[PDB]
């Protein structure tokens, strides 16, 4: 009979509800369908990203290693399952010694020889008190923990691919907007050079208009470098090259993603993968306590074989040479120097170590979901304010264009208004990128994109 | 006999004094009470911070794992100490074999069965030359390194909780100043809207007063998220949530911490816990060299038991069946093919690796303490030059307020000085937060808070 | 015989050429001399940096651990190589037991005290099918992987030392320009104080002049702190202190690094050390399959000894007590419970894991070299624009100095032009530092400085 104690899951050391305050919105309560059960095909609505994630889900190498670890742990589980059964083997022996006359039976030094081949098992421990079954269950729980870790690696890879793709999508728009600002500065320098060549401006204004262009083209260079260094960072995450037959993507202002229900915090114990990984490692540490307890109890070993024995090698195949052996053995320790007790304390300590690691994983998940809820609460007001700033800059540019077309303002004032519009659009692009990255990280922290479609 | 070499502590490859220069102050020499002897209750002068650290030293799970690891290594040391004793047990054996008619002693095939219940040991290695004692000493030193690791984890947790609390305390005042800047901008927009509706201001001055207001609103919405996102970071480090009945904390302008003596570079060898951990690992490797040395010498084992044996089953514990067995064994390897010398060389290489890691731990501790001393040397004049800036900006604000009260300037010019006051106060708050974070990290680097009060 | 499968190096899962776009130059094709064959002495053309590397390569404690791990794994290889030879040792025995009246040959309880002193081998497994040979090959391949890891650590240390020294060289020039800016601000404050004393200006201008000098005293302190905290990191990387007999260094405007050719990605498989380390790990995992295949085949163990056996204690000297024993045995498993097949599957899975890790090492090296080439293609135009900006600011300042020498402008405007000149001159230093850091990292990713001279 077994000796593994009864497993009881520890309570969550978090608050009962997600945090409130000025940053957070109202709590939605329970979830009809959780964010884990929502597949990543319905979450990401950009069809270019839906193909890039599909490329990265079988061309990546971290996901491939995390997939192969599950097979590596099944191969370790089958080994530990195999030790309950006896190891039937063929064992051929030979012995040739020369005892002296004192120790030999004939009172004379004579060379004695015995040979024989048997079929049978040696030292086959009969798992009566549940030791080898406890090690089997420990290996099975470690396999389940690896199976959860593969899903966690897939969710991390999906959120990383979406983050890098949105980063490239933002930096290309930044490059185009800086390419417009450089042309504005170039036109302003051309008008200042004309005004200096006719004799109305001095060299002091020509040098300032030169410094503006020479400061803009350095920004153009250091944004071209960023576009290339994000293309390389996406190519490394994909595992292969970027596919050529890709569908046309969406702009940053469109609704790229779908909102997900946060749900209750107690759902995080049921859906997030690494919490389940820590729980299964806790169950393995629990199953080790049975193997530590069974060392006190008696162990039963067995040795049994049957075959042919003879004096010389020629008498092996002959009839009448049948032989068998049957050796049972029981063993019970009485006095160890506190050895088995200290091993039992070692198992009981590592169970509490896994309890503490499980609780720390729950607390980390709660913290990085509350951060995403704070970001979702505040980024709506932040982007509404930035979009109103962009609209007011557009109205200022249209009014400056009316004063230019009428004839009151020269062209340098209109060029001064264009880059003031472009700065406001650049800041909007950066804030929208931060809003999308926080939502992608919230989707990873809530259970992630393990399923492809919704269940 | 013992073959462990005489342990010698290696010299620290650092300079004899803390570095000088125009960033550092002047070295004070020796220290009557070094920083490890100063507890964290008399160091942090905030009564709220002390209660938060009192919560964190009980509820944080990362400290709990390190508090269980020392007991795990204690159990491992007890297991390795238990090897110096014979394992006494009850062995109930049995044997029933059928042999052919030539190897049997009668020339006829028969069954030679016996049974026996004995009590005693087997393979008890008599530690004469000190192999198992050297392994016991290695387990003892590996136990002694783990409580130094626990002390280092406690110092790191104390510095992390203090840094997170000061970051929260600074970010709340940053939010409080951002709200006032937005309240300034809203009045400056309402006055421009009134002046536009009256007829004096064009619609090119309304739009830029609108863009200023939206630029303030976006900063408010991104500081609220920061306050929430480091409230969650404090809650994660505290283990449990923030308590409700808290004392009244101190503002950033007051003396929040205590000045601490730097001391000498030769004190880091005595008081910083990770250097003592790296030293005890070196003592463990020096102990393992003795266990590798003992393999060249003859090993002595013993097998001795006493019990009752019989030919058939029913006559086991009946009288006239007492028996013993005594077996000494001596082994000395003559020709291992360079195996034992390779194991000895491997032990020496492990000792040299621990030497190099010990010296690297000393060098990194010196680098951290010298960074903290440089920052302590320069932040005093940095914050002096920063407080003079806020004093001059406040004098500018009061002179502009006198001009407004007299009737020379309008209410649009006074608000442009109030914003400069707010900008200078925000920069002062940021520099003060940097000064306090550097002093908390300097307190950690010198030996940290492991004691609670002064010793 | 040997059961190790044939090793086939996998294909590079990268593109056949480095990427091309707006940020890259032209692909120079194959390199007649590679980047890994260029020594670091010829690459770093600064006579101070060469001496700093010639100190750091001897005094660093990470390179010492990496250069001792190759000796540890050489000893671990020699241990496994020693297991092919039989262990020849002397064995002293002895047995005293009182069998009961049933199991003794006399019919009465007899005491059978025998002894023996012999020399020979026990349990010597004959490696006919290549199990221990494949284990020796696995240990040899892991030794070669550690050999590659040492060179990878040396290249990383060289790149870190060069980056830290160039950062110190940049920050000292930043200190000098900040001192010049502070002197300009102090002269402006003295002129404004004099104009306030005569009565031309008001206190409203004196406070604004005071704020600008406090803002420079607050920056001088933090740049002094940056220079000290960077010197401490350089002394940490060097191991020992900075030597006093340093030769004269060079400025950042002078050409410090030799241009290295990029070559082809197919050279990355040949000369980067952390690709060869992942290759030798794969060869070790390939030898592990030959180690796992040999479990299905018969193992031939041997015991063989010769010496003097006797009954009394005094019989071990004289003749007539000699003895030998020769005991061969073969074992062949027939039925296991899927244990050997699971171990073979585990070996194949551990081969495929190292296949995936080798491909990921190739992809990481490709991404790093591609980022370095994207930096090299853009930093030329960025630095050209920045030094043209510095030249235009110098011409503007010289025209302002002409207007001051003539009599039109006062000293307040001439001093105002110098601050813009210093701002451009210290943006150029940051851009030059970023270019040199990217070039050092591109040299490290291409194969790095393993050799001192050109090979």
Author numbering:
A (entry chain A), B (entry chain C), C (entry chain B): 1 to 455
Cite, word for word, the article reporting this structure.
Firstly, the 3.2 Å resolution tripartite complex structure in nanodisc revealed a 1:2:1 stoichiometry of OprM, MexA, and MexB with a OprM trimer, a MexB trimer (MexB-trio) and a MexA hexamer surrounding MexB and interacting with OprM in an open conformation. The α-hairpin domain of MexA contacts the extremity of the periplasmic helices of OprM while the β-barrel domain and the membrane proximal (MP) domain interact with the funnel domain and the pore domain of MexB respectively. The overall structure was similar to that of MexAB-OprM stabilized in amphipol. A comparison of solvent accessibility, binding energy and electrostatic potential calculated from the Poisson-Boltzmann equation has been performed to gain a better understanding of the principles governing the interactions involved in the OprM-MexA and MexA-MexB interfaces. For OprM-MexA, we observed a complementarity of the electrostatic potential energy that was not present in the MexA-MexB interface. Furthermore, by calculating the accessible surface area and the gap volume, these two interfaces had a very different gap index resulting in a high complementarity for OprM-MexA interface and a lower complementarity for MexA-MexB. A simplified estimation of the binding energy at the two interfaces suggested a stronger interaction between OprM and MexA than between MexA and MexB. For OprM-MexA interface, the six helical hairpins of MexA established a strong and stable tip-to tip interaction with the six helix-turn-helices formed by OprM trimer in an open conformation (in agreement with molecular dynamic).
